[PDB]
């Protein structure tokens, strides 16, 4: 399996570039999710402050 | 081409490409499984290595994303509490 997968998977070398692109897109997807999470956090803070000011 | 399990996880991936604007990790869980299968049989060192390293980063970041989602839920709960009061 050592030399076997070496020669085989090296010939598969073009296919793996798409897998790299997959992982990179996964990272970008969760990055945008982190941006949305930050938007939600800041939204909760600002809205809670506004409600506090309305009731204070 | 395309592996059988690679095709299965890819089926789920293509079934949910961008239907998650904000969340910790839901579809990313099956993507974690996909990279697990990948690294179990993935080639090309150097380029490879960073994928399982970043996979471990994604696992730690998955726990951190769960913390961010739970804390955002706590912020929303406090907001609902102040609004109710």
Coordinates of N, CA and C in Angstrom, one line a residue:
Chain A
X1 N 0.8 -1.2 0.0 CA 0.0 0.0 0.0 C 0.8 1.3 0.0
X2 N 2.1 1.3 0.5 CA 2.9 2.4 0.5 C 3.2 2.9 -0.9
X3 N 3.9 2.1 -1.6 CA 4.3 2.5 -3.0 C 3.0 2.5 -3.9
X4 N 2.1 1.6 -3.6 CA 0.8 1.6 -4.3 C 0.1 2.9 -4.3
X5 N -0.3 3.3 -3.0 CA -1.0 4.6 -2.9 C -0.1 5.7 -3.3
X6 N 1.2 5.6 -3.2 CA 2.1 6.7 -3.6 C 1.9 7.0 -5.1
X7 N 2.1 5.9 -5.9 CA 2.0 6.1 -7.4 C 0.6 6.4 -7.8
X8 N -0.4 5.7 -7.2 CA -1.8 5.9 -7.6 C -2.3 7.3 -7.2
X9 N -2.2 7.6 -5.9 CA -2.7 8.9 -5.5 C -1.9 10.1 -6.1
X10 N -0.6 9.9 -6.4 CA 0.1 11.0 -7.1 C -0.5 11.2 -8.5
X11 N -0.9 10.1 -9.1 CA -1.6 10.2 -10.4 C -3.0 10.9 -10.2
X12 N -3.6 10.7 -9.0 CA -4.8 11.3 -8.6 C -4.6 12.8 -8.3
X13 N -3.3 13.3 -8.3 CA -2.9 14.7 -8.0 C -3.8 15.8 -8.6
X14 N -4.4 15.6 -9.8 CA -5.3 16.7 -10.2 C -6.6 16.8 -9.5
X15 N -7.1 15.6 -9.1 CA -8.4 15.5 -8.4 C -8.3 16.2 -7.1
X16 N -7.3 16.0 -6.3 CA -7.1 16.6 -5.0 C -7.1 18.1 -4.9
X17 N -6.9 18.8 -6.0 CA -7.0 20.2 -6.0 C -8.4 20.7 -5.7
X18 N -9.4 19.9 -6.2 CA -10.7 20.2 -5.9 C -11.0 20.0 -4.5
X19 N -10.4 19.0 -3.9 CA -10.6 18.8 -2.4 C -10.0 19.9 -1.6
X20 N -8.9 20.5 -2.1 CA -8.3 21.6 -1.5 C -9.3 22.8 -1.6
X21 N -9.9 23.0 -2.7 CA -10.8 24.0 -2.9 C -12.0 23.8 -2.0
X22 N -12.4 22.6 -1.8 CA -13.5 22.3 -0.9 C -13.2 22.8 0.5
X23 N -12.1 22.3 1.0 CA -11.7 22.7 2.4 C -11.6 24.3 2.5
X24 N -11.0 24.9 1.5 CA -10.9 26.4 1.5 C -12.3 27.0 1.5
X25 N -13.2 26.5 0.7 CA -14.5 27.1 0.7 C -15.2 26.8 2.1
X26 N -14.9 25.7 2.7 CA -15.5 25.4 4.0 C -15.1 26.4 5.0
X27 N -13.8 26.8 4.9 CA -13.2 27.8 5.8 C -13.9 29.2 5.6
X28 N -14.0 29.5 4.3 CA -14.7 30.8 4.0 C -16.2 30.8 4.4
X29 N -16.8 29.7 4.3 CA -18.2 29.6 4.7 C -18.3 29.8 6.2
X30 N -17.5 29.1 7.0 CA -17.6 29.3 8.5 C -17.1 30.7 8.8
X31 N -16.2 31.3 8.0 CA -15.8 32.7 8.2 C -17.0 33.6 8.1
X32 N -17.8 33.5 7.1 CA -19.0 34.3 6.9 C -20.0 34.0 8.0
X33 N -20.0 32.8 8.5 CA -20.9 32.4 9.6 C -20.4 33.2 10.9
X34 N -19.1 33.3 11.1 CA -18.5 34.0 12.2 C -18.9 35.5 12.1
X35 N -18.9 36.0 10.9 CA -19.3 37.4 10.6 C -20.8 37.6 11.0
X36 N -21.6 36.6 10.7 CA -23.0 36.7 11.0 C -23.2 36.6 12.5
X37 N -22.4 35.7 13.2 CA -22.4 35.6 14.6 C -22.1 36.9 15.3
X38 N -21.1 37.6 14.8 CA -20.7 38.9 15.3 C -21.8 39.9 15.1
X39 N -22.5 39.8 14.0 CA -23.6 40.7 13.7 C -24.7 40.4 14.7
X40 N -25.0 39.2 15.0 CA -26.0 38.8 16.0 C -25.6 39.3 17.4
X41 N -24.3 39.1 17.8 CA -23.9 39.5 19.1 C -24.0 41.0 19.3
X42 N -23.5 41.8 18.3 CA -23.6 43.3 18.4 C -25.1 43.7 18.3
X43 N -25.9 43.0 17.6 CA -27.3 43.3 17.5 C -28.0 43.1 18.8
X44 N -27.6 42.0 19.5 CA -28.2 41.8 20.9 C -27.8 42.9 21.8
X45 N -26.5 43.2 21.8 CA -26.0 44.3 22.7 C -26.6 45.6 22.4
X46 N -26.7 46.1 21.2 CA -27.3 47.3 20.8 C -28.8 47.4 21.1
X47 N -29.5 46.3 20.8 CA -30.9 46.2 21.1 C -31.2 46.2 22.6
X48 N -30.4 45.5 23.3 CA -30.6 45.4 24.8 C -30.4 46.8 25.4
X49 N -29.3 47.5 24.9 CA -29.0 48.8 25.4 C -30.2 49.8 25.0
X50 N -30.8 49.6 23.8 CA -31.9 50.5 23.4 C -33.1 50.2 24.3
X51 N -33.4 48.9 24.6 CA -34.5 48.6 25.5 C -34.3 49.1 26.9
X52 N -33.0 49.0 27.3 CA -32.7 49.5 28.7 C -32.9 51.0 28.7
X53 N -32.5 51.8 27.7 CA -32.7 53.2 27.6 C -34.2 53.6 27.6
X54 N -35.0 52.7 26.9 CA -36.4 53.0 26.8 C -37.1 52.7 28.1
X55 N -36.6 51.8 28.9 CA -37.2 51.4 30.2 C -36.4 51.9 31.4
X56 N -35.5 53.0 31.2 CA -34.7 53.5 32.2 C -34.6 55.0 32.1
Chain B
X1 N -15.2 9.5 -11.6 CA -14.2 9.5 -10.5 C -15.0 9.9 -9.2
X2 N -14.3 10.3 -8.1 CA -15.0 10.6 -6.9 C -15.3 9.4 -6.1
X3 N -14.8 9.4 -4.8 CA -15.0 8.3 -4.0 C -16.5 8.1 -3.6
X4 N -16.8 6.8 -3.2 CA -18.2 6.5 -2.8 C -18.6 7.3 -1.6
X5 N -17.8 7.2 -0.5 CA -18.1 8.0 0.7 C -17.9 9.5 0.4
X6 N -16.9 9.8 -0.5 CA -16.6 11.1 -0.9 C -17.8 11.7 -1.6
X7 N -18.4 10.8 -2.5 CA -19.6 11.2 -3.2 C -20.8 11.4 -2.3
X8 N -20.9 10.6 -1.2 CA -22.0 10.7 -0.3 C -21.9 12.0 0.5
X9 N -20.8 12.3 1.1 CA -20.6 13.5 1.8 C -20.7 14.7 0.8
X10 N -20.2 14.5 -0.4 CA -20.3 15.6 -1.4 C -21.8 15.8 -1.8
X11 N -22.6 14.7 -1.7 CA -24.0 14.9 -2.0 C -24.7 15.8 -1.0
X12 N -24.3 15.5 0.3 CA -24.9 16.3 1.4 C -24.3 17.8 1.2
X13 N -23.1 17.9 0.8 CA -22.4 19.2 0.7 C -23.1 20.0 -0.4
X14 N -23.4 19.4 -1.6 CA -24.0 20.1 -2.7 C -25.5 20.3 -2.4
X15 N -26.1 19.5 -1.4 CA -27.4 19.7 -1.0 C -27.6 20.8 -0.1
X16 N -26.4 21.2 0.6 CA -26.4 22.4 1.5 C -25.2 23.2 1.2
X17 N -25.0 23.8 0.0 CA -23.8 24.6 -0.2 C -23.7 25.9 0.5
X18 N -24.8 26.7 0.5 CA -24.8 28.0 1.1 C -26.1 28.4 1.8
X19 N -26.8 27.4 2.4 CA -28.0 27.7 3.1 C -27.8 27.9 4.6
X20 N -26.7 28.4 5.0 CA -26.3 28.7 6.4 C -25.6 30.0 6.5
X21 N -26.4 31.1 6.6 CA -25.8 32.4 6.8 C -25.1 32.6 8.1
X22 N -25.8 32.1 9.2 CA -25.2 32.2 10.5 C -25.6 31.0 11.4
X23 N -24.6 30.3 11.9 CA -24.7 29.1 12.7 C -23.3 28.7 13.1
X24 N -23.2 27.9 14.2 CA -21.9 27.5 14.6 C -21.4 26.5 13.6
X25 N -21.9 25.3 13.6 CA -21.4 24.2 12.7 C -22.5 23.1 12.6
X26 N -23.2 23.0 11.5 CA -24.2 22.1 11.3 C -23.8 21.3 10.0
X27 N -23.8 21.9 8.9 CA -23.3 21.3 7.7 C -21.8 21.1 7.8
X28 N -21.1 21.9 8.5 CA -19.7 21.8 8.7 C -19.4 20.5 9.4
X29 N -20.3 19.9 10.2 CA -20.1 18.6 10.8 C -19.9 17.5 9.8
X30 N -20.7 17.5 8.8 CA -20.5 16.5 7.8 C -19.3 16.8 7.0
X31 N -19.0 18.1 6.9 CA -17.7 18.4 6.2 C -16.5 18.0 7.0
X32 N -16.6 18.0 8.3 CA -15.5 17.5 9.2 C -15.3 16.0 8.9
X33 N -16.5 15.3 8.8 CA -16.4 13.9 8.5 C -15.8 13.7 7.1
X34 N -16.1 14.5 6.2 CA -15.5 14.4 4.8 C -14.0 14.6 4.8
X35 N -13.5 15.6 5.6 CA -12.1 15.8 5.6 C -11.4 14.6 6.4
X36 N -12.2 14.0 7.3 CA -11.6 12.9 8.1 C -11.4 11.7 7.1
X37 N -12.4 11.4 6.3 CA -12.2 10.4 5.3 C -11.1 10.7 4.3
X38 N -11.0 12.0 3.9 CA -10.0 12.5 3.0 C -8.6 12.2 3.6
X39 N -8.3 12.8 4.7 CA -7.0 12.6 5.4 C -6.7 11.2 5.7
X40 N -7.8 10.3 5.8 CA -7.5 8.9 6.0 C -6.9 8.3 4.7
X41 N -7.3 8.9 3.6 CA -6.7 8.4 2.3 C -6.2 9.6 1.4
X42 N -5.9 10.8 1.9 CA -5.5 11.9 1.1 C -3.9 11.9 0.8
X43 N -3.5 12.3 -0.4 CA -2.0 12.4 -0.8 C -1.5 13.8 -0.7
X44 N -0.2 14.0 -1.2 CA 0.5 15.2 -1.4 C 0.9 15.9 -0.1
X45 N 2.0 15.5 0.6 CA 2.5 16.1 1.8 C 2.8 17.6 1.6
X46 N 2.7 18.4 2.7 CA 3.0 19.8 2.6 C 1.6 20.4 2.4
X47 N 1.0 20.2 1.2 CA -0.3 20.6 1.0 C -1.3 19.8 1.8
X48 N -1.0 18.5 2.0 CA -1.9 17.7 2.9 C -1.9 18.2 4.3
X49 N -0.8 18.1 5.0 CA -0.5 18.4 6.4 C -1.3 19.5 7.0
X50 N -1.4 20.6 6.2 CA -2.2 21.8 6.7 C -3.7 21.5 6.7
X51 N -4.1 20.5 5.9 CA -5.5 20.2 5.9 C -5.9 19.5 7.2
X52 N -5.2 18.4 7.7 CA -5.6 17.9 9.0 C -5.2 18.8 10.2
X53 N -4.2 19.6 10.0 CA -3.9 20.6 11.1 C -5.0 21.6 11.2
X54 N -5.5 22.1 10.1 CA -6.6 23.0 10.0 C -7.9 22.3 10.4
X55 N -7.9 20.9 10.2 CA -9.1 20.2 10.6 C -9.2 20.2 12.1
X56 N -8.0 20.0 12.8 CA -8.0 20.1 14.2 C -8.4 21.5 14.7
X57 N -7.9 22.5 13.9 CA -8.3 23.9 14.2 C -9.8 24.0 14.1
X58 N -10.4 23.4 13.1 CA -11.8 23.4 12.8 C -12.6 22.7 14.0
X59 N -12.0 21.7 14.6 CA -12.6 21.0 15.7 C -12.6 21.9 16.9
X60 N -11.5 22.5 17.2 CA -11.4 23.4 18.3 C -12.3 24.7 18.0
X61 N -12.3 25.1 16.8 CA -13.1 26.2 16.4 C -14.6 25.8 16.4
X62 N -14.9 24.5 16.3 CA -16.3 24.1 16.3 C -16.8 24.2 17.7
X63 N -15.9 23.9 18.7 CA -16.3 24.1 20.1 C -16.4 25.6 20.4
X64 N -15.5 26.3 19.8 CA -15.5 27.8 20.0 C -16.7 28.4 19.3
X65 N -17.2 27.8 18.2 CA -18.4 28.3 17.5 C -19.6 27.9 18.3
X66 N -19.6 26.8 19.0 CA -20.7 26.4 19.8 C -20.7 27.4 21.0
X67 N -19.5 27.8 21.5 CA -19.5 28.8 22.6 C -20.0 30.1 22.1
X68 N -19.7 30.5 20.9 CA -20.2 31.8 20.4 C -21.7 31.8 20.2
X69 N -22.2 30.6 19.6 CA -23.6 30.5 19.4 C -24.4 30.5 20.8
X70 N -23.9 29.8 21.7 CA -24.5 29.7 23.0 C -24.4 31.1 23.7
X71 N -23.3 31.8 23.6 CA -23.2 33.1 24.2 C -24.1 34.1 23.5
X72 N -24.3 34.0 22.2 CA -25.2 34.9 21.5 C -26.6 34.6 21.9
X73 N -26.9 33.3 22.2 CA -28.2 32.9 22.7 C -28.4 33.5 24.1
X74 N -27.4 33.5 24.9 CA -27.4 34.1 26.2 C -27.7 35.6 26.1
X75 N -27.1 36.3 25.1 CA -27.3 37.7 24.9 C -28.7 37.9 24.5
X76 N -29.2 37.1 23.6 CA -30.6 37.2 23.2 C -31.6 36.9 24.4
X77 N -31.2 36.0 25.3 CA -32.1 35.7 26.4 C -32.1 36.9 27.4
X78 N -30.9 37.5 27.6 CA -30.9 38.7 28.4 C -31.7 39.9 27.8
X79 N -31.6 40.0 26.5 CA -32.4 41.0 25.7 C -33.9 40.7 25.9
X80 N -34.3 39.5 25.8 CA -35.7 39.1 26.0 C -36.1 39.4 27.5
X81 N -35.2 39.2 28.4 CA -35.5 39.5 29.8 C -35.7 41.0 30.1
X82 N -34.8 41.8 29.5 CA -34.9 43.3 29.7 C -36.2 43.8 29.0
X83 N -36.5 43.2 27.8 CA -37.7 43.6 27.0 C -38.9 43.2 27.8
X84 N -38.9 42.0 28.4 CA -40.1 41.6 29.2 C -40.3 42.5 30.4
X85 N -39.2 42.8 31.1 CA -39.3 43.7 32.3 C -39.7 45.1 31.9

